[PDB]
Design a protein around this ligand. Sequence first.
Ligand SMILES: NC(=O)C1=CN([C@@H]2O[C@H](COP(=O)(O)OP(=O)(O)OC[C@H]3O[C@@H](n4cnc5c(N)ncnc54)[C@H](OP(=O)(O)O)[C@@H]3O)[C@@H](O)[C@H]2O)C=CC1
Length: 345
Amino acid sequence: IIQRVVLNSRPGKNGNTVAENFRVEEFSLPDALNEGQVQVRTLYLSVDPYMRCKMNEDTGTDYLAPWQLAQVADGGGIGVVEESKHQKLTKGDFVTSFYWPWQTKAILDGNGLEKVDPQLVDGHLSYFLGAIGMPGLTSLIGVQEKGHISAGSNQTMVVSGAAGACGSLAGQIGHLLGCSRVVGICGTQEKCLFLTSELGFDAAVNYKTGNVAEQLREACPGGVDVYFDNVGGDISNAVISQMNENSHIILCGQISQYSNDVPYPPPLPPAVEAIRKERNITRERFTVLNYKDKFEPGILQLSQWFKEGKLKVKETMAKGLENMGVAFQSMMTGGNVGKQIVCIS
Ligand SMILES: NC(=O)C1=CN([C@@H]2O[C@H](COP(=O)(O)OP(=O)(O)OC[C@H]3O[C@@H](n4cnc5c(N)ncnc54)[C@H](OP(=O)(O)O)[C@@H]3O)[C@@H](O)[C@H]2O)C=CC1
């Protein structure tokens, strides 16, 4: 009856993922719930860049454990309760977890699940894995805490990985919080058009064209005061070179390095480091799990905006548990616009 996806092989610390890294298998769910458990039917599962690290024997992060071979993978999920021997939850209840196993159905611990209210997302439950969830909180809290945005101050925000989930939301949050100019950098023209025609970014820079330096100059004459960074690498050495004094880098992620033998908090190149030092550019580690008491208000704020249509939510949806592998790989190589999600039932 139940299908589950396990990690079949690892790509090596310096390898690129293949769909085949994951494998589907069938298993029998125990038909009896012991005290405290709930049986849930999986509705949606998330795939996210941090999972590339969990495919390594060593994740390089002390707060992410590696996945083991032949064992079921896991991550952000949203499902519906079917049977429940736990008081706070009953049939039809919608619950979520960041440790949801990649299974059609599961028997989880009631204390490990949080019930979500369909109203906050206009019924689109998959949003709780994105804009109205971890990714949106990362963009909102990242900006509110490391952004030093001052309404009317007339700052310019550069957002990398701008057509991804965190990027598309931050650029928009950027505007709503006071920045007057927001420019996104992404890997392709159609993504660029999405940023300016649907999200409202003032400009887009296609880095596949090959002259990020120059495009940036032109799109940013006046320097960069805020850089929501999702990619790191050359792209970042370029936004930084053009940042102004006392500006800030929200160090959200560095996806360009994930498949290279590289310590997540990599250090800027000597010359680039020199410039950061001179203009006094704040570049501090940012991990959203460190701001837990800011989640409910962040949730209420993001929901509010979404509900007023002030915050546009875009997603790319794949279908079926047997396609976790390919949806994960596809996202890591840019096949998604917005949050990558996989529909499970
Ligand atoms: N600090 C925190 O708490 C959190 C951090 N993050 C980080 O935020 C970043 C974005 O996450 P998320 O919104 O889930 O994912 P995205 O929705 O942004 O999906 C990944 C995107 O990265 C881009 N990309 C892939 N390889 C490269 C490359 N070599 N150079 C430049 N861009 C590349 C692609 O877009 P394109 O077509 O433009 O290349 C791809 O679509 C990640 O680095 C992630 O680790 C996420 C959650 C929390």
